[PDB]
Amino acid sequence: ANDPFTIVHGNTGKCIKPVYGWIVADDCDETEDKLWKWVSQHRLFHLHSQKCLGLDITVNELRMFSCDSSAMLWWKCEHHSLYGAARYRLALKDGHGTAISNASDVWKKGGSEESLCDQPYHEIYTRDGNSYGRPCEFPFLIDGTWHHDCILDEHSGPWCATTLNYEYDRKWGICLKPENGCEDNWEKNEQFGSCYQFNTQTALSWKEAYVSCQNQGADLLSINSAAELTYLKEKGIAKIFWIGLNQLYSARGWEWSDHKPLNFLNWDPDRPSAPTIGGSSCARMDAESGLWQSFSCEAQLPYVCRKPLNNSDTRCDAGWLPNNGFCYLLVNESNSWDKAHAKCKAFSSDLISIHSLADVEVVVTKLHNDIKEEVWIGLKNINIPTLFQWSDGTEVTLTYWDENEPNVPYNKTPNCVSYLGELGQWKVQSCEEKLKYVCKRKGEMCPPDEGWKRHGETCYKIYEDEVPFGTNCNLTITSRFEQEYLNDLMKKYDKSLRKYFWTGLRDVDSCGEYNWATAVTFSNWNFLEPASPGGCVAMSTGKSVGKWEVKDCRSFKALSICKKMS
Amino acid sequence: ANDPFTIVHGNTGKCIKPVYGWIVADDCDETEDKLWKWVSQHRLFHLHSQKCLGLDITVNELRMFSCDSSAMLWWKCEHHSLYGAARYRLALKDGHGTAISNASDVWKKGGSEESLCDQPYHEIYTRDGNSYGRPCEFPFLIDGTWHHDCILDEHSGPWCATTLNYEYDRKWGICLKPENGCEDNWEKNEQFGSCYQFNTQTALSWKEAYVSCQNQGADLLSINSAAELTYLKEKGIAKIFWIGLNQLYSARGWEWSDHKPLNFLNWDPDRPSAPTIGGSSCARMDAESGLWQSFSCEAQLPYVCRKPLNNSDTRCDAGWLPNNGFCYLLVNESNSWDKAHAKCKAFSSDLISIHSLADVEVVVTKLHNDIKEEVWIGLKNINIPTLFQWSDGTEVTLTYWDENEPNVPYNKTPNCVSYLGELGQWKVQSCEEKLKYVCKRKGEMCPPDEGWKRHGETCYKIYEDEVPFGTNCNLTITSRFEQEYLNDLMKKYDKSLRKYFWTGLRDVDSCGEYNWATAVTFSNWNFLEPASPGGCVAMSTGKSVGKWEVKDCRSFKALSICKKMS
């Protein structure tokens, strides 16, 4: 997976390499005798020796082995250290490699300071061939040579073995590596400005497909317009394939994996927004009927991939509450959407349009302290296939759907959404319902780039270095709306797991009391958390995005998010 | 779900109950007002209060909550103790319930001495209804009443809600509970002496199906004869359903979940013994075509399940090797199966039949030390509905298939198996091959009262109490054949995970050296094991059956296996 590296010793500055199978120190120069790689099952692979670093406990011995050996061949980094079987640490005595317990040695990659496993092992999934898209198995034996990477022939292109034994089995696939150009594996489309990849004879789970497109630099297929929906349904392009539409990795509701706005829809009524089989949270496209069906996120299906062709407060009238360049007025006289829209046209305005989470925050906290009551929103659909559009023509940037939303019914021509709940999230409604409504009309600093993004009257920033707790700063999460913005931010940053972020919640002492560094009004613990006292609290993305998990204050490191002007 | 219980305090002997929402000690009068239950997400549910025990951390408070509350409602047992959020332990001050750190209190179920988490939470899967077999979600709200178990209406039978919210969602299912009689959910069949249950409107993963019927007291369907195949092929049941044929929970090779002999086969050549999609380790039956297809163990498919209608030392001639009432002779003159069978009929004997793993051990270690050579076995098939049978009429009790075996080809009339490998495991062969062969002919205390099972010349025993390491005895695993027998024993005992067993391998001190309690010649570590030094080594069943994992010597408990008379 990805670049080879050299293993520099911290205390000496020498690079380790095997001679006759035994580890020795050497001058750190980038010749082919010092390059190390990561191969599957957490194995360290010396490229030139074609052998893998391992221990023999059957006291013990540290040397190179044939990479398919039964010896202990796995290695994990523990805070610059590198331990193996029974946490024996890789160390260097008199310039000779030896593994011993409690060793206080330091190792780091050559040319940087990051640990050996700082870069995660990236799977390289295949297409075509006989392997049905199963990922590359590194390394694999071909008549004497251990291959850690794809092979060039002309086999149609770069190819790899997909099982731990190529002498038997004989299963292989064409390597899908990240590209800059949009050919070989991709197909250009000037009409949409995005390259598509139709993995048709493959069979991957939705998470596996999303990882396959992540590692290719692309994203899972999102369909934003009717022109795209009518497309693909022609052409083999697979009979049924995955699409980025998922409920798994969002905080409630459905979304596109690339966080494009979810406003063009085409639910199969048999497998709709509210899934028939409970807990099936990942949708697929049927290239025959054209419909999108909710489905079990673990089913093995073909998949499509796409990537782009990269080229102050105000004042209003009395009663109207202000927010940035706009002002909102809530109407308690419950009315249909047509009557509310017309009545707000009479107020020389229109039904509210929402584009940021700040808009939701103000239209939940500045207007109320109802909550249970649904409130009308300008967003509406009139066409089949579904296309939600704002009443005031503004572009659809935000779609803040609740769980199992948007639940657009079959063939019903008018579909009119509203907001409910503590978070003000949206759900589709029959347009004749009589609800309250909110209407918008016009009214009347952080440091420069880079990395700062302003939410409301607070400036947020992502510190991108996997650093221990309390370094840089301590973020305080005051409300669930702040939590939601943090969720959107983390989601927009990292893909998908692998990267945690730091809260400011910490238990000094061990009494079991978690507090910020100077009132714990808001709490967002994950499943079975805290689970232990005296910890430092972190959060991540993916499923349970933003949920608080406890971490070791000593060893665990994560990224930082921090705010000013608060 | 399972039985309600009372929570007796260790130091006093009193069992706790809520009054006005606050926990107090009381005289254990086994009345319905002190009965506690387990509900999902590790929640403790008081039956009469219909509320769940919980903590408030926003300083510290222990009381009852509505089970849908956002408060900390989960509880985990730590060696008779019971901790919650941040490991605050349930305790009793002056007979009043309070959660405090480092509390040295003890709790036990009422009427016994087992801990609160000694009994595992059993899912109750459903059939019919609109939920497609998804399990019961306990508890569920119906107009004021929180229901922790299935309820009787006329609903056709017992029914439950399958989501966390039944007033919304409106998803329900028919309770599939363990039965004594063979009606209501089942269908009798005198021809086979086994009741069948065809879950057709369901969609479950292989593991969820196996657990569903495990919880039902039955086992996944195994087809042992052509009559059963022809029966299932006819029958208005599911077109495709799961069957117990799996390669996941075995040490290697395919087997039946009920450990029935795998000798009747019907592989679909499209999805055969050697899976098309690598990693597909769970097979299914097509009741239309009647073929068995290897498939992804995570696919949601219907499933069928069946339960029964319950109604040492010899000597031979020179050269021949002795084993109980039988004797084996290996022939090095490579020959076809027919030529070897005829030649051994000329020696007034027959091609070897194998019935125990001890037979495999002697025919691997007593006759040879090589290994790479395949050796003929008496087992053979002649039918197109595949049925392997011994040449000497002996009953096929053992089927010791290698990985991706039995690889029965399509329409091929003669199928003749052989043994290969270090473990002497079997694989199917074209019958014309010229191999060595082994032939058998006749020849010339523990007690079984106490749970002991004789393997070779050694008696083994499974102690049924989840006890800490070394309490009973320290088991030494000498050879891979002993490990294999242990796999058979554990598999026949426990279903499926959840129950660990104790080895004798242990690291006293923390140098990282694991040894038995009185030579580490044989080692069977699991993936990324040993993960830490100074541990006590246990093993389990399921996937990675018998593989050694390191565990805490203080807190971890497991079962015992121990041997005598060797």
Numbering used by the authors:
A (entry chain B), B (entry chain A): 32 to 89, 92 to 187, 189 to 269, 271 to 346, 357 to 414, 416 to 490, 500 to 573, 580 to 627
Give the original sentences from the paper that presented this experimental model.
pmcDEC205 (CD205 or Ly75) is an endocytic receptor highly expressed on the dendritic cells with antigen-presenting function and has been widely used as a receptor target in immune therapies. DEC205 belongs to the mannose receptor family, which also includes mannose receptor (MR), PLA2R, Endo180 (8), and FcRY. MR family members are type I transmembrane proteins with a large extracellular portion, a transmembrane helix, and a short cytoplasmic region. Their ectodomains contain an N-terminal cysteine-rich domain (CysR), a fibronectin type II domain (FnII), and eight (ten for DEC205) C-type lectin-like domains (CTLDs). The functional studies of DEC205 show that it can act as a receptor for dead cells and may recognize dead cells through cellular keratins in a pH-dependent manner, as acidification usually occurs during the event of apoptosis, but the mechanism of the interaction between DEC205 and keratins remains unclear.
